[PDB]
Structures are given as structure tokens and as C-alpha cells.
Design a protein around this motif. Structure first.
Motif, PDB file in Angstrom:
ATOM      1  N   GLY C   7      25.510  -9.379 -33.028  1.00  0.00           N
ATOM      2  CA  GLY C   7      26.856  -9.871 -32.755  1.00  0.00           C
ATOM      3  C   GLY C   7      27.302  -9.815 -31.299  1.00  0.00           C
ATOM      4  O   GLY C   7      26.683  -9.127 -30.477  1.00  0.00           O
ATOM      5  N   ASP C   8      28.405 -10.512 -31.010  1.00  0.00           N
ATOM      6  CA  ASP C   8      28.945 -10.734 -29.655  1.00  0.00           C
ATOM      7  C   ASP C   8      28.607  -9.637 -28.653  1.00  0.00           C
ATOM      8  O   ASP C   8      29.144  -8.523 -28.735  1.00  0.00           O
ATOM      9  N   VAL C   9      27.764  -9.971 -27.679  1.00  0.00           N
ATOM     10  CA  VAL C   9      27.415  -9.036 -26.610  1.00  0.00           C
ATOM     11  C   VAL C   9      28.530  -9.016 -25.565  1.00  0.00           C
ATOM     12  O   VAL C   9      28.870 -10.056 -25.004  1.00  0.00           O
ATOM     13  N   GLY C  38      25.830 -14.500 -27.283  1.00  0.00           N
ATOM     14  CA  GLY C  38      26.028 -14.019 -25.921  1.00  0.00           C
ATOM     15  C   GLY C  38      27.357 -14.368 -25.286  1.00  0.00           C
ATOM     16  O   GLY C  38      27.470 -14.354 -24.061  1.00  0.00           O
ATOM     17  N   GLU C  39      28.380 -14.648 -26.094  1.00  0.00           N
ATOM     18  CA  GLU C  39      29.550 -15.341 -25.547  1.00  0.00           C
ATOM     19  C   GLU C  39      30.420 -14.491 -24.616  1.00  0.00           C
ATOM     20  O   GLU C  39      31.218 -15.042 -23.857  1.00  0.00           O
ATOM     21  N   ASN C  40      30.268 -13.170 -24.682  1.00  0.00           N
ATOM     22  CA  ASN C  40      31.017 -12.257 -23.817  1.00  0.00           C
ATOM     23  C   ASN C  40      30.122 -11.494 -22.849  1.00  0.00           C
ATOM     24  O   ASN C  40      30.552 -10.506 -22.258  1.00  0.00           O
ATOM     25  N   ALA C  41      28.884 -11.951 -22.684  1.00  0.00           N
ATOM     26  CA  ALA C  41      27.867 -11.129 -22.029  1.00  0.00           C
ATOM     27  C   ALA C  41      28.066 -10.923 -20.525  1.00  0.00           C
ATOM     28  O   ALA C  41      27.682  -9.877 -19.989  1.00  0.00           O
ATOM     29  N   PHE C 149      29.091 -19.012 -37.214  1.00  0.00           N
ATOM     30  CA  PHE C 149      30.443 -19.566 -37.216  1.00  0.00           C
ATOM     31  C   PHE C 149      31.389 -18.615 -36.476  1.00  0.00           C
ATOM     32  O   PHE C 149      31.706 -17.522 -36.952  1.00  0.00           O
ATOM     33  N   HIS C 150      31.833 -19.053 -35.303  1.00  0.00           N
ATOM     34  CA  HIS C 150      32.674 -18.249 -34.421  1.00  0.00           C
ATOM     35  C   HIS C 150      34.137 -18.582 -34.692  1.00  0.00           C
ATOM     36  O   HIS C 150      34.619 -19.646 -34.292  1.00  0.00           O
ATOM     37  N   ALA C 151      34.845 -17.687 -35.379  1.00  0.00           N
ATOM     38  CA  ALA C 151      36.167 -18.031 -35.920  1.00  0.00           C
ATOM     39  C   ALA C 151      37.027 -16.796 -36.090  1.00  0.00           C
ATOM     40  O   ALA C 151      36.507 -15.686 -36.225  1.00  0.00           O
ATOM     41  N   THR C 174      31.178 -14.645 -36.443  1.00  0.00           N
ATOM     42  CA  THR C 174      31.402 -13.878 -35.224  1.00  0.00           C
ATOM     43  C   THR C 174      32.825 -14.168 -34.720  1.00  0.00           C
ATOM     44  O   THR C 174      33.536 -14.995 -35.303  1.00  0.00           O
ATOM     45  N   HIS C 175      33.223 -13.425 -33.688  1.00  0.00           N
ATOM     46  CA  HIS C 175      34.411 -13.636 -32.845  1.00  0.00           C
ATOM     47  C   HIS C 175      35.412 -12.483 -32.902  1.00  0.00           C
ATOM     48  O   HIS C 175      36.013 -12.159 -31.887  1.00  0.00           O
ATOM     49  N   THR C 176      35.607 -11.857 -34.064  1.00  0.00           N
ATOM     50  CA  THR C 176      36.670 -10.845 -34.141  1.00  0.00           C
ATOM     51  C   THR C 176      36.248  -9.468 -33.621  1.00  0.00           C
ATOM     52  O   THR C 176      37.082  -8.572 -33.486  1.00  0.00           O
ATOM     53  N   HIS C 177      34.955  -9.307 -33.343  1.00  0.00           N
ATOM     54  CA  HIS C 177      34.413  -8.073 -32.772  1.00  0.00           C
ATOM     55  C   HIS C 177      34.518  -6.843 -33.690  1.00  0.00           C
ATOM     56  O   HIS C 177      34.417  -5.700 -33.239  1.00  0.00           O
ATOM     57  N   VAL C 178      34.710  -7.077 -34.982  1.00  0.00           N
ATOM     58  CA  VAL C 178      34.716  -5.992 -35.946  1.00  0.00           C
ATOM     59  C   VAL C 178      33.824  -6.365 -37.129  1.00  0.00           C
ATOM     60  O   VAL C 178      34.045  -7.389 -37.780  1.00  0.00           O
TER      61      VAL C 178
HETATM   62 FE   LIG Z   1      33.452 -12.491 -28.581  1.00  0.00          FE
END
Ligand SMILES: [Fe+2]
Ligand SMILES: [Fe+2]
Ligand SMILES: [Fe+2]
Ligand SMILES: [Fe+2]
Ligand SMILES: [Fe+2]
Ligand SMILES: [Fe+2]
Ligand SMILES: [Fe+2]
Ligand SMILES: [Fe+2]
Lengths: 264, 264, 264, 264
Positions: C7-9, C38-41, C149-151, C174-178
Motif C-alpha cells: 500500500g501507499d508508500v 507509489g503515489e506518496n513516495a 482502486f484509489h478511492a 488504496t488512498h485512505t492510508h488505513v
Molecule cells: Fe496516498
């Protein structure tokens, strides 16, 4: 070619205002095309078959809609059976009804396109790309092309107006129920106004009962949906398009209420 | 007393427009009080110390603000040194600066209050209850009370206007950068308009470069923050209050641009 | 075949966590395909070319993205030139990069699709219709189809999972970081989880410095964008697909932090 | 002290799960306090008096709520009249009901606080400052303090948990109807989880009929409000507070469904 457009009709007070003043406006301005946004006509949201016909009888050649198009399910019973009703074109493919209609009146033809904005509203298809598609289709049939853009954000409305300058004859905004003073002709000849305003109660909040709306703001508790009753207002525009140049040459605002008496 | 209020000043073109026309408007209308919303004055967002003084120099008595108040962090360095800068009063307790100021002319004080709407905006404290608090406080001191309500939703703006009718002398809306045509005096004597509009580029989108804004709508990709350059516009209102009855008796819109030329 | 998804790095701490643990996870689980979001990498938002290569080196076969895809502008200069990097497919036609990629590796083939939700997010193209379109494209070539699915909205994520059941091999959110605890195999065989979670700081707020985030909630004032220091965490899933039936047969959550020690 | 908390009860299937499993859970874990979020209990939204009594009958000591508190209007006639029912405390002053309740068991008293987030939700009063106020009140009466924070955004939920670490005994999130896997004890001893999840249909979308929700996403048209049929699930947590140190020492997730069979 002259177009008379009447902003969002709200409930019975709006319907009464249309019944009285549209015929008078038509006598005064002699428009070739009369378009009315009826998205709030059925008790504040949506449309019934009876109301569609009464709005036509009042002088509309076509009716445009908006985010409340579907609020009275009865619309599904008649929408594909009546000839001059438009809903936002950028509802997904397969949606009942149509997003463009060609109004044939007084020997002329006007393409009437309805679109809905996405800022602060549901995620419909992109109205910019949809505008391009419908403008190119319309241009094959008539150089007279009118868009009622039902949207919340002033940025999105102005963007569409500028984006379609010289390609649409006119772009008028609806949805916010407050007429704007920025009516103008853009550099390439498109008439533009950010919002035409509403037709309905004058002393509600956007047509709604004041006490309920204020209570909701102050309490964050739900309130009954209640249309206002009392003084009334009508909001519209009259747009002139040059028959030789196909450019808009005038866009005049109409307001009729206790603060703006109607003459003649 | 007469109040001249100028809508959101956007960047250097807005500042240029103020420098030229505010003095001319003061000569023409001879207002007792002049108020300018400066929330976009520092290259499109926020405020600097030099710009504050420059706006005062052009003829402003007080400067109101909005959602971009804090965008230039320099503001924290001077907010305690300037005398008539007002930011939205409903930011949380402990916020730097103030939400009300008093200016005096011809023997009478005007209370100037700034509030920010919450619909489509950050969840500040409730502006309705804050208005009650500030109106009550100001009324102990003067019956002349002016509110600049910086908000997006027409419903929220009209609700506040009606809610404070007869308690505030005038409520004017800002934020959407498009002037509305609904200037009126409410039944208990409060002058009201939904949005005064903006002062700045005329042929951008709300003051921003057209190409960038249209690109963002069409692509959903980020774009550079870019203030427009070119033709300019100024939007304002002139409000008259009867100092015997304390009721507003006139609210007139001001528009200055190539479609509305200025006459001395 | 077996898929490992991370998940989101988030920033350097996330990259450090990937460098240390992805090789260990690959040794432990022996996945045929490894996918990393890698959207926050790059310091919390976007992706640089250097980091793209670093994620590949750490063991990624493909990299998926999200709403921050475009935040580091250098991506425009490499997105079209590197293999197996995808961005959300439902950005409009004309957007740089690809929304689907086909990974051939460890002996087999996997279609990897990235989509972005619209609830509480920008108005992209409809991800449901886009999912139909890309699944049909992928199904011309391979039966193995994976969707990131990033939502934001749980309703939207579940809806897509159920909508694609029996057509995608696996759909992960992905997206909510939890990380969510609802990993399951849907009735027609599609592996599903609402959110895989994030990889990065464990004691921030979604990776961000706690005091800055709390301050923003309490004051409504701007704060510095600051990635958190301290303890780190990694979130992922391991998914098994039956090579004969094409049904997913196991989906196991991975958590590595002080509360969930890693065992080799 | 041991607390059992049951996440959003949705409709009759949720009520069915509570009736069967809460007694079994109380037998298995022997909690001193049992709390249920009943905000969707009455056919998916709101709470009737009959259902309030039935939830207590099933083993609840206290019932917490959320954004649907007011949907069944009979609540206005019983909310102030029954014990241990709470609604979000950050509704404005003058709202019916209360936002904190004290439940007594053995020699122990548990303060139960309900709050509602504002991100993606209505603009209530600030829940952070309200938490400060209520925790300070509660702490004078008991060191056992429990918060059910009904919110959408993971950032807001985590921010409240961290903000109140060491001051509340436990902070659990509700509203998104999907259980998170991030249950942990924060550094200063507060038990925390981002979302406990829901209790009701397992094969709907957050408890709602799948086909209606998918239709809404694909069409943007109205759909009927319909609670899902089929298999069911229960989501909860069990939290242990050390009676000497007043720190939380354990937080265990409960899931009961086809993928997580119940033992005992
Ligand atoms: Fe993210
Ligand atoms: Fe309307
Ligand atoms: Fe509308
Ligand atoms: Fe502004
Ligand atoms: Fe603003
Ligand atoms: Fe994201
Ligand atoms: Fe719920
Ligand atoms: Fe809820």
C-alpha cells in the motif's frame, strides 16, 4: 433571431408567475424562441406531465432542466413521449430523455442544449467535452446554438462560456437562483450570463420557506422541504443574434418583482 | 450616511483598478465610509503590509478579507500593527487579528464585520451565531452595522441577510467574483446583495488566466496558479442609510469595465 | 499464481520500509508478481524517476499511483518512457501515461489496472465504465486481472469490488492510508479488500506530522506539509489465484510495525 | 475494566445479529460495559423507541448514535426521557438529547461520549474542542472515558485519537461501515481504532442492496433506499483498561460472519 429565456421555475408560485408574465414578455419582445428552465416546477423539484404542458401553454417552445430532473419519478412515464423537453446532456449514456432538442418555431431553428456542472454537484460526464460534441452536431443543422448550463461554481460557468465562445451563440447559467449582473457578449460573439436567476417566491431563500432554511443553518437538524409563499419574482434574459453574422449582439436582463416593475 | 464597498481585489490589476477608480468614485459619490475586500490582493491571494497601506492610501477606511486571509504568512508579522484590517470573525478563538472594526465619519461610527460561509468551504465556527454575537456587541456602541459575508452558497448568503434583517444595516456578499443583480432593501430595512463581485482582470476566469483554468476543467490535471493580465474591471456598491430611521434607503451597484464605462 | 501488493508508500520512511521489507516478503512468500502503490513516495506526494527505479530495485514488478500522480512535475518526462508504471486510467483521454500494463514475470502474465474514485475526489471519468472497458481489453489477452482502486468512499470501493466480481482476479483499495480488516473472496471468486493501508510513518496522521495535522483541524489555518518522523509501518496483501479455476483462493493481510512484528 | 462496543447496527438484519450475538459475546468476554452504535437501527437510519428498548434488552448498557440520529422523528419525543442514549455532542447548543452519559457497573463508572466529524459531513461545532470540554468534565467524575467518534475521514479520526491520547481511555471510530485493522494502544495509553465497522448485511454495500448502489454509481439517477438481504455480519471491539494505571492494555477486534466463524 431573438431568444427569451426564463430562469428556474420554482413550484406553484413560479408557475403562476410564468402564466401571467411570459405571455406579456412575448408580446413585449416578440421572441422567435422561448425557453424555460422547469427543474423546480413540481412543488420545488422535478416535473409532472401536467406541468410540462402548462409551461408550454404559457408560451414556452422548449423546457430545460437540471439536477432535480429525476426527483418526481413520474417523469420517466412521459419524458420520451413529449417533444420539447431537454435534461442535462452529460448524464451517462442510456439515461432517458435527451440533452439536445431542435426548436422549430416562427420559421427558424434553434439548437437547445442543457448541460450540468460538476463542481459541488454529482460526478456526471465532462460537460466541456459534451459541449464540443453537441455543438459540432448542432452546427450541421443550424448556426443558432443555445446552452443552458446548470451549475454551482462561477468558475465552471465562466470557463464554459469562454471555452465555447464563437461556437455557441449563447451560454446562460442556471442553478443558483440569483441573477447575475455580468451579462455580456464575449469577444467572438457569444452572449453570456453567469446565472439567469429564478422565477418563484421573491422573499424565501431561493424559493424555499425562510424559517426552515435558517433553522437548518443554525441547528444542523433536518427540516421539512417547504416551498415559500408570498411575493413572487421572474428572472430571464432576452438575447438577440444577428442573422447575417450569426453573432450575438445584445443580451438584456429581465427582472420582475416589487423592486422592478414590469412595463408595457 | 453613505458607504462605498469594493469587491474582492485580485492581484496587481485589481490594485491598479483601485488606485485609479476608488478616488474617482469617492469624488463622484462622496461616501462617508469606504470599505474594500482585499483577500486576493497579494498576487491573487492574501495580503502584504505594503498592500494594506496602499489600499488605505487609495481611499479605503477599512479592509475586509476572506478564505485566503492567511495564504501569505507575512500577514502574521503585521496583523497586530495595522488598525482597520478585518478577517472573518468566525475563525476559532485564538486566531490572530479581529473580526470587527469601527471607523468614524461625520460624528457617527460604522461597525465593520467580516464573516465567512461554511457551505463548500472549511468548517469554521457558525457564522449565524457569530453574527448574533457581533451585532449585539456593536449595537451597544453604534446602530450602524455593516457585514461583508464571504461565502460560496447563495442559500447561505440569503439566509444570513434575512436572518439579520433589521439588526445589521447592510449585508453584502463576497467570494464568488461575479456581481449579482439582486441588490435590494429587505423588509426591516437592511441593505442586501448576494455578491458584489470582483475588482481585477475582466477577461480571465474570476481573475485567473483563462487557458490555465479551462485546461484544469478539461484535464483534471494540476495547473500553475496564474493571475490574468489584460482588460480590468471594478465591482462595488454604494449604500445609503437614513440616520434618523437607521434603515437603509438605497443600494446601487457599481460596475466599471469596457461594457460599463465610468462617467464622472 | 501469487500476488504481493504494497500500500501507499509515504515519503522516505516509506521508501526505507520498502527497501528493507519487500525483499524479505518476496523471500517469505515467493510471489510471482509484486505491485507497489507509489503515489506518496516522493516526500509525501508524487513520484520522481529516481524513486521509480528504487522501487523496482526493491522488488516491484509494477507501480500503481493515485491522486498525487502529477505532484512532482518530472513525472511528465519519464511516465511514457518507463515500463510497468500506471496511473489512474480514468483521467481523460490525452492524459500522459497508461492506466493498464501487462506484466510478464516469474513465468506468467498479469494485467494491472489503476483506477481512481470520484466520491470526495475530483470529477474524473466514470471508473465503473472504465473498469468495464479495461477488463474487456485485458480479457482479450489474459485471464489474470488485478485492480488497484484509489478511492476515499467505502461505498464506492465496495461497489466496484462487487461490480467486477468474477471478472477481475482481485480488486484492492488504496488512498485512505488505513488498512481494513474486510479482506475476503467475493462469491464469483474475486479477492477483495477495502483498503490495503499505507507504508511509511506509523505515528503520524496518515504519514504526516501529527502536530501540523491537529493544528489544521483545530485552527482552520494553513500548516506546513511535513512527513512524520519516528516509527514506521508497512501494509500489504498477499493474494493467491488458482491457475486452473481462475478464482482467488486466499487473501492475507500484511502488517509490519511495533504492534505486528515481522517473522521471516 | 472491560468494554464491549458494537459497530453501526443496520436495519433488521443488524438487529437480528445483535439479538443473537451480543449475549454470546457478553458470556464470552464478560465486559463491565456494553455499548452499541444504533444510528442505522431503524430500517437503516435513525432509532425508534421500540428499537432503543430492544437494543438494551439484547445487552447494551448505552447506545451511541451519529449523523442519522434525527431520521425517525419519534426520537424527539423520547430522547430526553430514556437513560444512557447519546447523540453527537457537537450538535449546536439547544439540540435535543445529550452527548455524554455515565454508565455505572460494579464500583466503576464509564463516561460515554459521542462526537461527529466534520470532514465530508455537516458543519457541526468543532469536535476537538468539544472533546476537550467533555473529557475535562468526565475526568472530574471518573477516569474511565470512552469516545465513539462518528466520522468519514481517516485523517480526522486519527487526529482525534492522537489529540486525546492519555486523556480518553478509548477512542473508537464509526460511520464508514468497514472495520479497520489498525487497532492499537497509543503511546500514552489510549485504545484506538479508526473504524469498528458495521453490524447487518454482509453482502450489501455498507448494508444496502448492491444493485441499487451500483446503479446509483453508474447512472447518477435516484434509487430506492433498500437494506440488503442475505448473510449477515457483526463488527465490534473489546477493550481492556487497567484498573490501577487507568491505561488501556488491550484492544481486540470482533468479526462474526461466514469468513470469521464465532466460537463459544
Ligand atoms: Fe496516498
Ligand atoms: Fe433550480
Ligand atoms: Fe439546480
Ligand atoms: Fe476572492
Ligand atoms: Fe474567497
Ligand atoms: Fe491518495
Ligand atoms: Fe452508520
Ligand atoms: Fe453514519
Amino acid at each position: 433571431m431573438r431568444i427569451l429565456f426564463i430562469g428556474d421555475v420554482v413550484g406553484s408560485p413560479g408557475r403562476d408567475m410564468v402564466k401571467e408574465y411570459v405571455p406579456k414578455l412575448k408580446t413585449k419582445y416578440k421572441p422567435h424562441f422561448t425557453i424555460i428552465n422547469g427543474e423546480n416546477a413540481a412543488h420545488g423539484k422535478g416535473l409532472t406531465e401536467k406541468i410540462y404542458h402548462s409551461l408550454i401553454q404559457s408560451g414556452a417552445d422548449a423546457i430545460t432542466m437540471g439536477n432535480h430532473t429525476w426527483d418526481k419519478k413520474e417523469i420517466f412515464d412521459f419524458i420520451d413521449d413529449v417533444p420539447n423537453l431537454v435534461r442535462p446532456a452529460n448524464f451517462p449514456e442510456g439515461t432517458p430523455g435527451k440533452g439536445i432538442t431542435y426548436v422549430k418555431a416562427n420559421g427558424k431553428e434553434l439548437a437547445v442544449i442543457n448541460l450540468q456542472g460538476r463542481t459541488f454537484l454529482p460526478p456526471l460526464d465532462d460537460p466541456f467535452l459534451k459541449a464540443d460534441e453537441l455543438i459540432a452536431e448542432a452546427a450541421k443543422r443550424t448556426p443558432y446554438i443555445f446552452i443552458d448550463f446548470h451549475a454551482e461554481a462561477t468558475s465552471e460557468k465562466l470557463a464554459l462560456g469562454w471555452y465555447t465562445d464563437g461556437r455557441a451563440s449563447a451560454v446562460v447559467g442556471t442553478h443558483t437562483h440569483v441573477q447575475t449582473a455580468d451579462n455580456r457578449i464575449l469577444p467572438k460573439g457569444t452572449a453570456y450570463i453567469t446565472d439567469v436567476g429564478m422565477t418563484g417566491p421573491y422573499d424565501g431563500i431561493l424559493g424555499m420557506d425562510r424559517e426552515t432554511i435558517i433553522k437548518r443553518f443554525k441547528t444542523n437538524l433536518p427540516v421539512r422541504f417547504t416551498v415559500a409563499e408570498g411575493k413572487t419574482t421572474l428572472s430571464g434574459v432576452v438575447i438577440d443574434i444577428d442573422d447575417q453574422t450569426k453573432k450575438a449582439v445584445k443580451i438584456e436582463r429581465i427582472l420582475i418583482n416589487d423592486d422592478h416593475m414590469f412595463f408595457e
